[PDB]
Ligand binder design. Structure first.
Ligand SMILES: Cc1cc(OC(C)C)cc(C(=O)NNS(=O)(=O)c2ccccc2)c1F
Ligand code: NA
Ligand SMILES: [Zn+2]
Length: 268
């Protein structure tokens, strides 16, 4: 019997996938998690006692982004191993393809929180390899179900590229993406490339956005905005076509933006 439901913060969330919590935790009807330190617990009564004792009110590590009540904390897997392991176990409940939960030292984790008077409330996160041979600027990216489709995943995607820009490098999320992750990346890539084309080669779009040329190309292909000439993909779009796409329906929700002025981060 697996964990099939969690209590975290004020949320109850059904699981989507197996996550390898220890077997005596899986047998319970519900797993209870501290939303701040991510300790997982077996019983409502151990949970209630923890909440009265636990002094964390935000993620560990350093706050590398803060604008109003939106916060990102950078957590080195080697300096906060238990926390990062608990995060990985939580994420695996909602990610089919994640496979790494306990060997977190090679990773840095970026925790998105929404802040009120009580504390910084976890919304989702992405992990990133400290050293990525493959040029992945995201390893796993997860938004908790009650926050999905509300602009938070777009924020974290945009955030992963802002770090890539600061590293003077392109990057791409590690494959395979979850289904919602796929739709989300395609929509983010469209928005960013279309906005840059409104206001340029494929290589220019790549250097301006840190989106890889392959991701740019496959995005422009889905928009039917690339020609092929003698073995080369070549952008082929009119300003009017760009605006037709941009004011269409799916680009209408106002984003949580990443304000680079509020990003406190130096490339390793
Ligand atoms: C990357 C990602 C992962 C995710 O978790 C899954 C893995 C369980 C959820 C989201 C998410 O919530 N997307 N919706 S969105 O933020 O409103 C958004 C609107 C427009 C363009 C991009 C995103 C997400 F982006
Ligand atoms: Na649910
Ligand atoms: Zn706690």
């Amino acid at each position: 019997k697996y964990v099939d439901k969690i209590h975290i913060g004020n949320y109850e969330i059904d699981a989507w996938y197996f996550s390898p919590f220890p077997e005596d935790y899986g047998k319970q009807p519900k797993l209870w998690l501290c939303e701040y330190c991510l300790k997982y617990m077996k019983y409502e009564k151990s949970y209630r006692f923890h909440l009265g004792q636990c002094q964390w009110r935000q993620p560990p590590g350093k706050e590398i982004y803060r604008k109003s009540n939106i916060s990102v904390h950078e957590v080195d897997g080697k300096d906060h191993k238990i926390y990062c392991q608990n995060l990985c176990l939580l994420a695996k409940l909602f990610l089919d393809h994640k496979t790494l939960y306990f060997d977190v030292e090679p990773f840095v984790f970026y925790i998105l929180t929404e802040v009120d008077r009580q504390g910084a409330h976890i919304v989702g996160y992405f992990s990133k390899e400290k050293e990525s041979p493959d040029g992945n600027n995201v390893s796993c990216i997860m938004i908790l179900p009650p926050y999905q489709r509300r602009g938070y995943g777009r924020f974290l995607i945009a955030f992963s590229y802002e770090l890539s820009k600061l590293e003077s490098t392109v990057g791409s999320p590690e494959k395979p993406l979850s289904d919602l992750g796929k739709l989300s990346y395609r929509s983010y890539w469209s928005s960013v490339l279309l906005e840059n084309l409104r206001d340029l080669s494929i290589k220019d779009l790549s250097q301006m956005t840190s989106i890889t040329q392959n991701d740019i190309i496959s995005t422009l292909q889905s928009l039917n905005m690339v020609k092929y000439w003698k073995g080369q993909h070549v952008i082929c779009v009119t300003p009017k076509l760009v605006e037709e796409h941009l004011k269409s329906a799916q680009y209408k929700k106002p984003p949580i933006t990443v304000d680079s002025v509020c990003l406190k981060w130096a490339p390793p």
